[PDB]
Design an enzyme around this catalytic site. Sequence first.
Site, PDB file in Angstrom:
ATOM      1  N   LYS A  48      34.943  55.803  48.857  1.00  0.00           N
ATOM      2  CA  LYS A  48      34.358  55.679  47.365  1.00  0.00           C
ATOM      3  C   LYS A  48      33.249  56.805  47.116  1.00  0.00           C
ATOM      4  O   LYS A  48      33.366  57.480  46.325  1.00  0.00           O
ATOM      5  CB  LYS A  48      33.831  54.138  47.122  1.00  0.00           C
ATOM      6  CG  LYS A  48      34.772  53.291  46.620  1.00  0.00           C
ATOM      7  CD  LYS A  48      34.039  51.923  46.543  1.00  0.00           C
ATOM      8  CE  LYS A  48      34.839  50.879  45.946  1.00  0.00           C
ATOM      9  NZ  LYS A  48      36.135  50.419  46.647  1.00  0.00           N
ATOM     10  N   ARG A 176      45.923  64.841  42.850  1.00  0.00           N
ATOM     11  CA  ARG A 176      45.331  66.010  42.584  1.00  0.00           C
ATOM     12  C   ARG A 176      46.311  67.367  42.891  1.00  0.00           C
ATOM     13  O   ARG A 176      45.868  68.392  42.687  1.00  0.00           O
ATOM     14  CB  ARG A 176      43.983  66.269  43.629  1.00  0.00           C
ATOM     15  CG  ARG A 176      42.937  65.282  43.326  1.00  0.00           C
ATOM     16  CD  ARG A 176      42.426  65.209  41.951  1.00  0.00           C
ATOM     17  NE  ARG A 176      41.065  64.423  41.877  1.00  0.00           N
ATOM     18  CZ  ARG A 176      41.149  63.345  41.626  1.00  0.00           C
ATOM     19  NH1 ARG A 176      42.235  62.571  41.048  1.00  0.00           N
ATOM     20  NH2 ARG A 176      39.697  62.613  41.403  1.00  0.00           N
ATOM     21  N   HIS A 739      49.792  18.058  50.337  1.00  0.00           N
ATOM     22  CA  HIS A 739      50.517  18.610  49.492  1.00  0.00           C
ATOM     23  C   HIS A 739      51.851  17.467  49.201  1.00  0.00           C
ATOM     24  O   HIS A 739      52.584  17.105  50.132  1.00  0.00           O
ATOM     25  CB  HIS A 739      51.402  19.817  49.967  1.00  0.00           C
ATOM     26  CG  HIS A 739      52.589  20.261  49.321  1.00  0.00           C
ATOM     27  ND1 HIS A 739      52.520  20.591  48.182  1.00  0.00           N
ATOM     28  CD2 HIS A 739      53.853  20.214  49.645  1.00  0.00           C
ATOM     29  CE1 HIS A 739      53.839  20.855  47.567  1.00  0.00           C
ATOM     30  NE2 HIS A 739      54.620  20.874  48.612  1.00  0.00           N
ATOM     31  N   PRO A 743      56.026  22.739  44.353  1.00  0.00           N
ATOM     32  CA  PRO A 743      55.513  23.694  44.746  1.00  0.00           C
ATOM     33  C   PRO A 743      55.479  25.073  44.093  1.00  0.00           C
ATOM     34  O   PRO A 743      56.179  24.924  42.805  1.00  0.00           O
ATOM     35  CB  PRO A 743      56.210  24.287  46.080  1.00  0.00           C
ATOM     36  CG  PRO A 743      57.763  23.740  45.951  1.00  0.00           C
ATOM     37  CD  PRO A 743      57.421  22.349  45.064  1.00  0.00           C
ATOM     38  N   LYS A 794      37.597  14.679  31.653  1.00  0.00           N
ATOM     39  CA  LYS A 794      37.460  15.268  30.613  1.00  0.00           C
ATOM     40  C   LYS A 794      38.315  14.901  29.560  1.00  0.00           C
ATOM     41  O   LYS A 794      37.970  15.238  28.146  1.00  0.00           O
ATOM     42  CB  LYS A 794      37.814  16.937  30.720  1.00  0.00           C
ATOM     43  CG  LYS A 794      36.868  17.723  31.453  1.00  0.00           C
ATOM     44  CD  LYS A 794      36.849  19.303  31.351  1.00  0.00           C
ATOM     45  CE  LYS A 794      35.535  20.070  31.970  1.00  0.00           C
ATOM     46  NZ  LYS A 794      35.992  19.994  33.517  1.00  0.00           N
ATOM     47  N   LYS A 839      32.522  23.113  43.782  1.00  0.00           N
ATOM     48  CA  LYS A 839      32.748  23.949  42.795  1.00  0.00           C
ATOM     49  C   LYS A 839      32.871  25.204  43.323  1.00  0.00           C
ATOM     50  O   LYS A 839      32.272  25.879  43.938  1.00  0.00           O
ATOM     51  CB  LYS A 839      31.782  24.097  41.731  1.00  0.00           C
ATOM     52  CG  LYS A 839      32.214  24.977  40.475  1.00  0.00           C
ATOM     53  CD  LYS A 839      31.196  24.605  39.322  1.00  0.00           C
ATOM     54  CE  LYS A 839      31.102  25.745  38.321  1.00  0.00           C
ATOM     55  NZ  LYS A 839      32.713  25.957  37.903  1.00  0.00           N
TER      56      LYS A 839
END
Length: 1286
Positions: A48, A176, A739, A743, A794, A839
Amino acid sequence: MTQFEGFTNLYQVSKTLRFELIPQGKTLKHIQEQGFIEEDKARNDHYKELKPIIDRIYKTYADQCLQLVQLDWENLSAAIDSYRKEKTEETRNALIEEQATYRNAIHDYFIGRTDNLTDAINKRHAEIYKGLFKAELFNGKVLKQLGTVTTTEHENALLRSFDKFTTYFSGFYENRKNVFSAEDISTAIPHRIVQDNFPKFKENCHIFTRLITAVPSLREHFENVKKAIGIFVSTSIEEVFSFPFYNQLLTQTQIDLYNQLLGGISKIKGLNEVLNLAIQKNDETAHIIASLPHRFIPLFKQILSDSFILEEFKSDEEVIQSFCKYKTLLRNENVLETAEALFNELNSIDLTHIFISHKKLETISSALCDHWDTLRNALYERRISELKSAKEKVQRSLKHEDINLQEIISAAGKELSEAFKQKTSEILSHAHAALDQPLPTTLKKQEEKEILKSQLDSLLGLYHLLDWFAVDESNEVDPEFSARLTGIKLEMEPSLSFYNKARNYATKKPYSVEKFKLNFQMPTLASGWDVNKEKNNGAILFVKNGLYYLGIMPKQKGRYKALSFEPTEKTSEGFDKMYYDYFPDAAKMIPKCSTQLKAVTAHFQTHTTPILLSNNFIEPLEITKEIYDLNNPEKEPKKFQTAYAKKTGDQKGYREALCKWIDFTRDFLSKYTKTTSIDLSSLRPSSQYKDLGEYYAELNPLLYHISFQRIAEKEIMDAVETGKLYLFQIYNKDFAKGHHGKPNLHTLYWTGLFSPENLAKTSIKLNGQAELFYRPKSRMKRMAHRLGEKMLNKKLKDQKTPIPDTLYQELYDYVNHRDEARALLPNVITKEVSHEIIKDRRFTSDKFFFHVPITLNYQAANSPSKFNQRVNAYLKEHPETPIIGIDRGERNLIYITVIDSTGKILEQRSLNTIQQFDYQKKLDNREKERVAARQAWSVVGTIKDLKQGYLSQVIHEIVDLMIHYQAVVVLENLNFGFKSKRTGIAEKAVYQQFEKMLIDKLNCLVLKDYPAEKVGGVLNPYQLTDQFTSFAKMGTQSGFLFYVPAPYTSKIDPLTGFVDPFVWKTIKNHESRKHFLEGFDFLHYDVKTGDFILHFKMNRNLSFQRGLPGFMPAWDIVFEKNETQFDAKGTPFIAGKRIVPVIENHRFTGRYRDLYPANELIALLEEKGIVFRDGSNILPKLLENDDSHAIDTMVALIRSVLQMRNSNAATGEDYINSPVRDLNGVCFDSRFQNPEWPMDADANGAYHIALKGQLLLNHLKESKDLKLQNGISNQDWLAYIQELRN
RNA sequence: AAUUUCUACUCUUGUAGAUGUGAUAAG
DNA sequence: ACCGTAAGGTCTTATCACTAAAAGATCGGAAG
DNA sequence: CTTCCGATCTTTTAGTGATAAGACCTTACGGT
């Protein structure tokens, strides 16, 4: 016959799969011990830092090399003239060839092919250029050869750090390189010299010569200016404005000096300022220079020669400090008073030399007049009245031509000036407040963010008002004004970047996604998977008990020295290792490995005897000179290539060459040691192939193979214990312990890639060039639900309706014991915390990631051919195909209607509730809190992302319905129409990206429930759409997706296609509405039904109609008798009721009121007392009084009955009532809720989108050439739909 | 309120749908 | 003879890679 | 001590058929 399941395996679709890598066993310790992570972080940081330094090196070389450029420009100048006088088609080709010759002449200086230079210097420049894109750059000897280069020891160390690691910069090199190339691309040195800047210098030279011949006494005056500014003192102005002085002006410094000469130091007066000071002197010399072109055009800046800017803010203190610095800079330069001085001096400067950008025009109209179309219409009527072809010329001159201030001020009246003097002052006052108001100490609380919002908004508004004025070339802008305005606008430009970056900071996620590539000291980690390259690439895979692992083999003591695992018997316990055999695309890898070798090219330049190659061949391969000439004929068509067949028509020679080459490649593949074991017998005989591309397309899937072999567990466990192998588990959610659900698609592709039936016949290919990444731990403030706390759902008891997000926080506070929420307290459900949820957990720890490309439909061709023709052939074969019309509504987000071939409704349904969640209620709550939060940045971010997620659900719903009905899908073309802010997903960009995502889904459609062998399964995906290219280029059809223009689909009666023909904006004055009433034939009260019937003939009121005649000659508009009708459910509703918006001060108030037009008209009739209820004609008895009030309320009534959509979100009303009755004598009402017709008014638009799809399909069926009409004109639609319904 | 990543969630230590990445130019 | 309408010619699209082997650079050791 | 040679690491190397449609400008015919 063709079949719908035949739309599969048509073209290769490349994708990539991303996975997390979980380090197994000891590996992480070794990765921490060797420190690969830190050195890769350092390498990314150095890359960078190092890109602008290498750009500075390229600038240094370009400036060093351009000074040697000397050419005579007369020939290209003569070509420029010859084109500009004649426009002859020979002149354009001669000019392009001349420009190419000059570009090659420039390009030879860099690469060292310039015969105008000495051989030693030319060779030196060649060496410098060829060393500039190599490892030699990083080794530093090219900087030794390139004198006077300004790098320090730190920069030199940054260069040395990437030695033997050039592969990081390959994309940067690929970019370039084109800058120095001779190509006709815009971003190149020769293009900027010869095509952009040189015509402007020629124009400068000619303009100067013309002015000198016009006014000789100006000559010494111009010379005096050059003596004043003191640029180019070694040469005269007469020599400056001449072609050989363009031997200079190539470097950026000379370009800046030339522009500074023209404009003056930003004092010293430039040539333009002196010319306009002469023109204001008002003498005969001023008049004659006014008769000539009298301004110089400055040259463009050189390429790669591009400032108050900084990186995106990391903290609220950082943004508040930076913005305080910016406001301090604005107050110190005292910019706003310079703005005020400019906005005074507009009243005195001659307005003919000041221009508005035309693209801002409508905005300024809404800034200075009542509506966004007012001022545009004012200039149109002016430019007509000052005088169809002339109308077109006026439209052209207002669409893409800038307007001077004199014309605008003369057209719209003096009051605009007062309004302008209002607007500037107002905005300046706000800006003044924004500079005096202090900054908040932080942005943790709402009003602090509101203060920052208001200050940035006021500064950006002042930037926009400055942006109103044009600064573009070829406009005769005053130099002094343009200099002042460009200066202040440059001073105010960082306000836009501040607004964007502050909005991004206030919108950004709390975590950081940014991650960097890992290399493990290997310049080609995971570049490929072949077992011969296993040593140099390091990466391998394993399968064990259905889990997948990646093994990275590091360098040992700087050497590779890669270990090898012996295979074992399959019953022995342990991993299964992939053995990957690949020989990449045959077209490039046979001439590489056989015929473009250095040995054979050396041999056939000096011999004609065929050469016997032996190395890497199991038996010697003879190469005959005829085959090498077939590959290297010194002309661009190879004799086996189809370009040769196009060029010559030598079909027999083309077939002989093709047979010879294909037979040679068969011999090669039979002899070369990578491919000698492959069974080539599946290939057809060589003479049967029509072209070489078909041969390679069939050949390539044979050269790829994957097998697996078992390795004992101990052999891998000991290797990973020693640190010879870094074993990671390739992981996602679907490999978790818990699981149990369906999927992901990216797990389905991964599992399908290693299925045994895929290994037997490759449908998905495992691509090389995989990439490892590492994401560091974020500065995450941890929030997790502790044990014994309450978890708050919710959703309510019904999963459909979500809790409003403003109430959710205080609800969650209340149930943990930390009045709308009180009202809905028994409606909510809580859970015990069974196990702690963290979270944003995946950002709480640093994680490895793995990006692996795959290629689906590997057996098919690289690109589809005439896919639309295949789709249209299938559609012509199956006229019974249902049509799925898609529209986005005002009270449900997206509504679909599936119609039959007869136009009958098969199904109609809204997509509010997807997966038992009502997205409309969620978006309504978000909009409510958006208005409550006075349009903060956070809520609009969480609205845009929610719309994106909702459309990602919509894609599955659409494609499930498309597979179920086997139907063409017709969608709204966004190039044509416009949608009100009342509609959800109103944003054009969001729905455009949804249509792009729908195309991308439907190219490689895989359904989860299907078996892998079934069409639509993992190994046989549906391909129902062509590859996306661009929104403006995809046209009216992409595969099975039809795009039809939006207008006249929503506000149209479904029963007979009636549309209100009038435009009410041309009616509001009293004479117009009087004529409008006069133009109707007659209306009368029906004694039997109680209705009023008004008769209109389509040949009347042309001054009030829109430009779209319908198919029907006449309409019987009906004022229905207001009566409690009852629907199919049984609820009462008032027939004929209209809901009209209340207007004050020519603006929508946001209130609605209810009208009952029949009852109101009876009240009118009895108030006037004229006799009715007898079948007599009402209209002359009404208009004969010439009561202005009567005509006003009559026009209001007529506009009320023609209101098609009637809706009020507060009461929940949203319906369509037709004011016209069909041949069955009944008016439409969606409020009857009949299944046969659109039940709610949003369904009507999707129904007519489906009917436009049927229009295209019918024209396709009538046609013979498999093509759609390439567009629907509104006249054709408004003819067809009401002709079909009669 | 858990995710290769995103969106919306929580009967289920997870659910449903989507998901072509990287580089460079650029918006 | 001048103007209106319809058909043809060409300009333009953000691109690239998804790779194994041939070719070249490097360097440690042996021979004279 | 220089020079040549074998192992090994890293950088460069071959290249096939396929379009395709929206839009602006120019040209030619028909109508007045």
